[PDB]
Design a protein around this ligand. Sequence first.
Ligand code: Z68
Length: 282
Amino acid sequence: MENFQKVEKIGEGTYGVVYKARNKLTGEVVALKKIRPSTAIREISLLKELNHPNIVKLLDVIHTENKLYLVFEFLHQDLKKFMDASALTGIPLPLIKSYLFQLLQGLAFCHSHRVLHRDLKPQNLLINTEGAIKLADFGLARAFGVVVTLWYRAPEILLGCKYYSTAVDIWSLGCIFAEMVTRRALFPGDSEIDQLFRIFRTLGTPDEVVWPGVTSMPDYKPSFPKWARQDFSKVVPPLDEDGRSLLSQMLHYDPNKRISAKAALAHPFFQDVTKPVPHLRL
Ligand SMILES: Nc1nc(NC2CCCCC2)sc1C(=O)c1cccc([N+](=O)[O-])c1
């Protein structure tokens, strides 16, 4: 309140309440995030340096009265709400393609700077009236270190691996891509084991052939049921073969086999990519 004017609470984020606020000095409207450690302050502050058209800008890190706040650029809609609003007709393919392309650019940028997100989901993908889509919260997970949605969690995380790689973000993005296409979450698990088994029932229970080292993951149990992989054309109909091919590469079990954001940008699926204007009701 000393330095801002609260417009309204807009949601509950991973780390605390998020408000739409107005900077007292500048009059600018921002997304103010209250964080519910000195190591973190220094680390997060470095994120202020990230600047890319597809990344929500971290405007400032404020540490006052022994409270921590992160100030982010404000956008008017998120992908979760946009998908809900578009459920009757579906998001036009050209726009799904444009959003996926832009999201991969944001990931390629962050990953090139050694910054992972680790918790990508429709709620932290923000859109504006000009057709841009941006990712918010990259790098917070590493700096802070932990009802939460498990729908977009990579299998290695669900299997208890405590070492993350850029591949966890590609997995989440693949799940989001599938959801934009079918208008339904790909793997809507209600628990970690349900999340894992939903993945197994669709992509097949992983083994040492497709994922070397999987049987040695922390939470892997030899007792996991063995489900056969489903035909991929049944998972995201009516997406064409270019889209299905790209999606399959984003959903490989072995994180090391998962396509990189950079390589994905070159996939044939983006041969005819454009930047359409979305119809946003604000
Ligand atoms: N920058 C930014 N602009 C936002 N405007 C809202 C978009 C949805 C409609 C209301 C305004 S939301 C936001 C976040 O960064 C954000 C990410 C994860 C979660 C939340 N959250 O509130 O729970 C917020």
